[PDB]
Amino acid sequence: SKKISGGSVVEMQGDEMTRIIWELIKEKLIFPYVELDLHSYDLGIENRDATNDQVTKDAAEAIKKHNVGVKCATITPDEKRVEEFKLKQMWKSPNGTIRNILGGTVFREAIICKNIPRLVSGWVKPIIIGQHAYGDQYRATDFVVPGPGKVEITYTPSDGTQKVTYLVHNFEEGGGVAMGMYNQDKSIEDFAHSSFQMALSKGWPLYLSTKNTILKKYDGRFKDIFQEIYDKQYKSQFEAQKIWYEHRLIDDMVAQAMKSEGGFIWACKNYDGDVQSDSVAQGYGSLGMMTSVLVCPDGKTVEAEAAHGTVTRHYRMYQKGQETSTNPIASIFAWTRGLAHRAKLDNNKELAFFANALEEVSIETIEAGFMTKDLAACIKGLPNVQRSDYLNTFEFMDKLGENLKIKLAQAK
Amino acid sequence: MSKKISGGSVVEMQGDEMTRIIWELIKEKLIFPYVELDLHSYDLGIENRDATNDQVTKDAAEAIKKHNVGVKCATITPDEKRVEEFKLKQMWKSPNGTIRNILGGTVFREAIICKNIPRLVSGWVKPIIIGQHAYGDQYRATDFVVPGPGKVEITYTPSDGTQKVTYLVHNFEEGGGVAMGMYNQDKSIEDFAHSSFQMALSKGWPLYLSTKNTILKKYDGRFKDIFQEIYDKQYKSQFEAQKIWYEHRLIDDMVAQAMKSEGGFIWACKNYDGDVQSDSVAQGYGSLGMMTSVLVCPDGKTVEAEAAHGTVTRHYRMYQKGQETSTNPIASIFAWTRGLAHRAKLDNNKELAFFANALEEVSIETIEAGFMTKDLAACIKGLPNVQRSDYLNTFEFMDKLGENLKIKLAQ
Ligand SMILES: NC(=O)C1=CN([C@@H]2O[C@H](COP(=O)(O)OP(=O)(O)OC[C@H]3O[C@@H](n4cnc5c(N)ncnc54)[C@H](OP(=O)(O)O)[C@@H]3O)[C@@H](O)[C@H]2O)C=C[C@H]1[C@H](CC(=O)O)C(=O)C(=O)O
Ligand SMILES: O=C(O)CCC(=O)C(=O)O
Ligand SMILES: [Ca+2]
Ligand SMILES: [Ca+2]
Ligand SMILES: [Cl-]
Ligand SMILES: [Cl-]
Numbered sequence: 001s002k003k004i005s006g007g008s009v010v011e012m013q014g015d016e017m018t019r020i021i022w023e024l025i026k027e028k029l030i031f032p033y034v035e036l037d038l039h040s041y042d043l044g045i046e047n048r049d050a051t052n053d054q055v056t057k058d059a060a061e062a063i064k065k066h067n068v069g070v071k072c073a074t075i076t077p078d079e080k081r082v083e084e085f086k087l088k089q090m091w092k093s094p095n096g097t098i099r100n101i102l103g104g105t106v107f108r109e110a111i112i113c114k115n116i117p118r119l120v121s122g123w124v125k126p127i128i129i130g131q132h133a134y135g136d137q138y139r140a141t142d143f144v145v146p147g148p149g150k151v152e153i154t155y156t157p158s159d160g161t162q163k164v165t166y167l168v169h170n171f172e173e174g175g176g177v178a179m180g181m182y183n184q185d186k187s188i189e190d191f192a193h194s195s196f197q198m199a200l201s202k203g204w205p206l207y208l209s210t211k212n213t214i215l216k217k218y219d220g221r222f223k224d225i226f227q228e229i230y231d232k233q234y235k236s237q238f239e240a241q242k243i244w245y246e247h248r249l250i251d252d253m254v255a256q257a258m259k260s261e262g263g264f265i266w267a268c269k270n271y272d273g274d275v276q277s278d279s280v281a282q283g284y285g286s287l288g289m290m291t292s293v294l295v296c297p298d299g300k301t302v303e304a305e306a307a308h309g310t311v312t313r314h315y316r317m318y319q320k321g322q323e324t325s326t327n328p329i330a331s332i333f334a335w336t337r338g339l340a341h342r343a344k345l346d347n348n349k350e351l352a353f354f355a356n357a358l359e360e361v362s363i364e365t366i367e368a369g370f371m372t373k374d375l376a377a378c379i380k381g382l383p384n385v386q387r388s389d390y391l392n393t394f395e396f397m398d399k400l401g402e403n404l405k406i407k408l409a410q411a412k
Numbered sequence: 413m414s415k416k417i418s419g420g421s422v423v424e425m426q427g428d429e430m431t432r433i434i435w436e437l438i439k440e441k442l443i444f445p446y447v448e449l450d451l452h453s454y455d456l457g458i459e460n461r462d463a464t465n466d467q468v469t470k471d472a473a474e475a476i477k478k479h480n481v482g483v484k485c486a487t488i489t490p491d492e493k494r495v496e497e498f499k500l501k502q503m504w505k506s507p508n509g510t511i512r513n514i515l516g517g518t519v520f521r522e523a524i525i526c527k528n529i530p531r532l533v534s535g536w537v538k539p540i541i542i543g544q545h546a547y548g549d550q551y552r553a554t555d556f557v558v559p560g561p562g563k564v565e566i567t568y569t570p571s572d573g574t575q576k577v578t579y580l581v582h583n584f585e586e587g588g589g590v591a592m593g594m595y596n597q598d599k600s601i602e603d604f605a606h607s608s609f610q611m612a613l614s615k616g617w618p619l620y621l622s623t624k625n626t627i628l629k630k631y632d633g634r635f636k637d638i639f640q641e642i643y644d645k646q647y648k649s650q651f652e653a654q655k656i657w658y659e660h661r662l663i664d665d666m667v668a669q670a671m672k673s674e675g676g677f678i679w680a681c682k683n684y685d686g687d688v689q690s691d692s693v694a695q696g697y698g699s700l701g702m703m704t705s706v707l708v709c710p711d712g713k714t715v716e717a718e719a720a721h722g723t724v725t726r727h728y729r730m731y732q733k734g735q736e737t738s739t740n741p742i743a744s745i746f747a748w749t750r751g752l753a754h755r756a757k758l759d760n761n762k763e764l765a766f767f768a769n770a771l772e773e774v775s776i777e778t779i780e781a782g783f784m785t786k787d788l789a790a791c792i793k794g795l796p797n798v799q800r801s802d803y804l805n806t807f808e809f810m811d812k813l814g815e816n817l818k819i820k821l822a823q
Contacts, residue, residue: 076626093626119534119671120696137624141566141579142631145595148571153554153581153593157562166554168566168593177631178595180566180581182558185589211550211684213489213506218555218590251688255695258532271624272688275664279692282668283533 004350006034007342010062012043012094014072016310019044020318021328021393022072025335028401033354033408034339039066043094045075049087056094060101063303067345070338071098071305072331095305099133102303103187104296105194105267106131108277110284111291111329113366116378120283125263127280130198131273132191133294135183138270142179145171151178183218185225190297192226195267196234198295199243206245208267209253222269223247254279286378291333293341300345304337306330318393325373326393332362332400357411361403370399417763420755421450423475425507427485428457429728431719434741434806435485441814443748446767446821452479456507458488462500469507473514480758482716483751484511485744486723511716512546516600517709518607518680519544521690521720523697524704524742526779529791533696538675540693543611544686545604546707548596551683555592558584564591596631598638603710605639608680609647611708612656619651619658621680622666635682636660671696698791704746706754713758717750719743727806738786739806745775745813767821774816783812 014022030036041059048055063069075081076093099106109128145151151168168178199206208226212219230238230245238244248256250272257266257280268276281290287308294303307330314324336355343352366375376389391399426432443449454472461469476482488494489506512519522541558564564581581591612619621639623632643651643658651657661669663685670679670693681689694703705720720743727737749768756765779788789802804812 117534121530121532121534137627139582140628140631141581142628143568143577143579144630144634145568146570150569150571151566151593151595152569153564153566153591155556155558155562155564155591157560158584159560159562164556166556166593168554169552169595171571171595171597174598176595176597176599176601177634178566178568178593179628179631180564180579180591180593182564182582182584182591183589184584185587188589213491214509214550215553215555215592216503217557218592221557221590251691254688254692255700258692258695259700275667275685278664279667279671282671287668287672 003033003035004348004354006036006339006351007346007348008037008039008066008068009338009342010059010066010069011038011040012059012069012071012074013040014043014306014310015045015075016312016315017318017324017326018073018306018310018331020315021326021331024394024397025328025332028397029332029358029404030335033404034351043072043074045077045081045085045087045091048074048091048094049085052088053091053097056097057101060098063098063102063301067301068338068342069303070334071095071303072334073306073308073310075310096138098303099294100139102294102296102301103190104133104294104301105191105198106133106273106292106294107198108273108281108290108292108307110281111289111333111363112284113289113363113375115367115369116285116289116375118283118285120258122260123262123284125261127257127260127262128198128202128204128265129273129277129280130191130195130265130267131277132187132268132270134187134270136181136270140179140181142177145175145178147175148172153180183221185221188222188225189229191267192229194295194297195226195265196230196238196245199245199265200234200237200241202265203241203243204264205243206265206267207248207253207256208245209248209250209272210269211250213249219269226267286375288327288330288374290330291337293337302338302341304334304341306334314393324393325390325396327372327374328393328397328400329362329366333359353411354408357407358404361400361407365400365403370396372396416446416448417761417767419447419449419752419764420759420761421452421479421481422751422755423472423479423482424451424453425456425472425482425484425487426453427719428488428723430724430731430737430739431486431744432457432723433728433731434739434744434810435719437807437810438741438745438748441810442745442771442817446817447752447764456485456487458490458494458498458500458504461504461507462498465501466504466510469510470514473511476511476515476714476716480714481751481755483747484508484716484718485747486719486721488723508718509551512707513552515707515709515714515716516547516603517707517714518604518611519546519686519705519707520611521686521694521703521705523694524702524746524776525697526702526776526788528780528782529698529702529788531696531698533671535673536675536697540670540673540675541611541615541617541678542686542690542693543604543608543678543680544690545600545681545683547600547604547683549594549683553592553594555590558588558591560588561585566593596634598634600710601635601638602642604680605642607708607710608639608678609643609651609658612658612678613647613650613654615678616654616656617677618656619678619680620666621658621660622663622685623660623682624663626662632682639680667692699788701740701743701787703743704750706750715751715754717747717754719747731806737806738803738809740785740787741806741810742775742779746772770820771817774813774820778813778816783809785809
């Protein structure tokens with residue numbers, strides 16, 4: 001009779017074809033059933049340029065205040081984009097910026113449809129990657145070494161005691177490159193807690209990967225912190241659910257994951273999580289069918305995003321009124337994951353039911369054979385797909401909407 | 413009369429535990445009956461590395477520079493438990509890391525494929541060869557704990573006496589943590605590029621380099637720029653003539669594209685990525701342990717072929733108690749065959765070249781005929797379904813290879 005009152009959500013609008021899909025999702029799938037107190041931040045490239053990227057920081061601050069953010073894919077400028085949009089600077093990726101402000105762990109997991117074939121034969125249960133969202137390469141200082149000379153890294157305590165100087169390399173034959181990077185104890189502790197809690201929440205074992213055989217001090221610190229927290233705070237809960245936590249060397253881990261059946265949480269350092277989550281998503285059948293949710297250290301704030309790109313080539317055709325077949329699932333599940341968290345915070349049973357029903361309809365629709373071109377290509381091979389094998393962007397969104405209406409009405 | 417092949421000079425690095433047992437069996441049953449060698453042997457077992465404060469590892473690397481061919485048995489890389497088990501003077505670094513740091517070059521890794529061993533990744537009908545840059549980055553880094561608030565900086569002091577340059581790494585104001593510095597060398601990157609372009613041209617396959625230059629714009633940008641300059645100026649015409657190409661890819665794009673591909677390309681990897689992704693790729697072809705690993709040095713004349721991965725401690729303990737084991741020797745065998753094949757190339761030795769290939773063929777044919785160790789039978793049937801009649805123990809398998817090798821060499 002009346003729409004679900006859904007509460008406060010921070011929306012981060014994006015670019016190009018994902019921006020188009022984003023507005024379709026709202027128009028056809030969300031707003032006909034849900035009324036929201038939407039706090040909207042335009043992270044389009046033109047508004048980021050207009051505001052000297054201030055809108056991105058304001059959006060992150062709004063997520064802290066309202067505890068739920070949902071983010072559309074954005075352009076990370078390069079030189080070509082600077083020329084295309086006459087940018088004032090080559091602005092940094094909003095995702096890096098938001099993650100650095102909020103902190104936490106990005107959990108990434110495939111979105112699985114029975115008729116979309118896996119590439120890895122054994123993966124019959126899901127693999128959830130928890131990517132530490134702070135530090136390491138993403139805050140590093142790198143530079144070109146122009147010629148022979150010495151590179152050192154130093155630590156000067158703030159409390160006035162004596163410095164320590166570590167030789168990096170004496171460049172004796174030429175130049176090269178060098179870099180320093182760091183991470184913080186508290187961030188690592190938050191990463192550990194989020195990983196143990198996720199594993200207990202799903203009832204799956206947890207592995208952390210490092211390369212502490214080589215980086216005995218840097219990666220040893222991750223290994224040590226996880227083990228201490230596990231022993232003192234989570235081990236008895238794990239044993240009660242008959243699950244476990246173990247550290248693994250990263251190269252052992254990627255091979256162990258390859259040969260596994262799935263069904264574990266995989267805690268990754270920032271870089272490894274960035275890389276391995278794409279490998280895993282592709283192994284489940286489609287790189288694009290993936291959820292990506294930043295879980296912040298306060299245990300109450302979340303940011304759900306559509307991972308990967310803005311699909312520029314489809315946007316160019318759309319702008320010319322040409323037919324496209326853009327997969328909206330990752331954008332839809334950014335909304336449903338955000339709304340499901342909003343519902344849990346508010347004990348809003350109607351919104352929780354809605355968010356889960358939309359995820360069900362999305363998967364059921366694809367499983368009934370209605371699907372965009374990229375998914376049909378998973379089944380038949382891309383050079384072999386014909387027009388009758390798939391739905392265009394609007395046909396697919398319309399089929400979702402008609403299936404969502406049926407699902408919500410049947411439950412009433 | 414009856415004669416053996418005159419094989420020439422080879423540097424041998426002996427190793428630890430079960431791989432050491434297998435190593436000696438390979439020489440005794442498979443190499444020495446057919447090949448005479450000028451063997452320059454270095455004991456890289458954990459006890460002798462400790463006794464020499466790791467000097468033997470350096471001596472062995474220097475011997476490879478002299479004789480241009482090394483073959484290496486798997487070695488223990490000590491952890492806390494190994495330090496206690498052998499009362500070590502230090503948690504010594506991996507010998508492979510030390511040797512690679514001394515020799516430099518590119519480590520090429522590739523699956524050893526048997527028709528009856530199923531892949532885990534559906535589309536991989538052709539091989540993926542990873543060229544792992546073998547020098548620098550995380551494997552020569554300096555890392556440390558930050559015990560509390562304070563400033564970490566990194567500074568460059570030019571040799572020529574001009575003014576030093578200092579960059580702020582991090583101001584720790586809320587606690588402690590960790591930090592590290594790493595580096596790489598232009599000349600080493602250039603050698604890595606040359607080896608990668610030459611390997612692609614020798615195979616007739618395209619070449620991809622992965623980096624994360626979106627994030628490390630100077631450090632990884634330097635890899636990208638050196639590769640592109642060397643390509644444009646020295647190899648692009650030859651690539652186009654063979655209808656292949658070179659392209660840079662972001663590492664997270666590359667791992668997904670690799671997993672969705674059919675194979676058939678060279679994948680140039682920075683040290684860390686090559687270490688990690690070569691294990692993923694070998695496992696994806698069916699068996700982590702079936703892989704070749706050959707360090708190709710920058711001089712274009714020196715190689716070190718290694719048995720990659722572990723020493724199979726659990727089998728070694730069983731062996732020490734007189735219990736039956738089923739230890740796969742293929743990776744150790746192919747270290748010898750790849751080393752001898754390069755030796756044959758340097759010396760223009762057709763007999764040695766024929767032998768090295770024959771041993772590889774015998775190894776593959778034997779497994780494809782249904783004679784293998786337990787690990788491989790588990791690839792086919794699933795470990796819970798493997799019975800004794802599904803496999804050969806360690807000595808039965810080596811003897812089967814011996815008999816098939818004798819037959820093959822009788823043309
Ligand atoms: N690095 C990326 O990937 C990211 C992309 N961006 C921007 O997005 C724009 C374009 O990016 P691009 O690389 O051009 O990819 P795109 O999204 O166009 O997809 C290529 C082809 O895949 C097919 N395809 C893709 N999606 C769909 C779909 N939904 N439905 C159907 N087909 C699809 C289609 O195929 P076709 O049908 O055309 O044959 C398309 O063309 C640039 O501004 C980037 O900055 C944003 C963030 C990064 C993040 C990290 C970060 O910076 O914060 C990241 O991942 C990393 O770097 O770590
Ligand atoms: O070198 C080591 O420490 C173990 C061997 C290894 O990791 C490898 O061969 O890839
Ligand atoms: Ca990425
Ligand atoms: Ca390794
Ligand atoms: Cl359309
Ligand atoms: Cl035996």
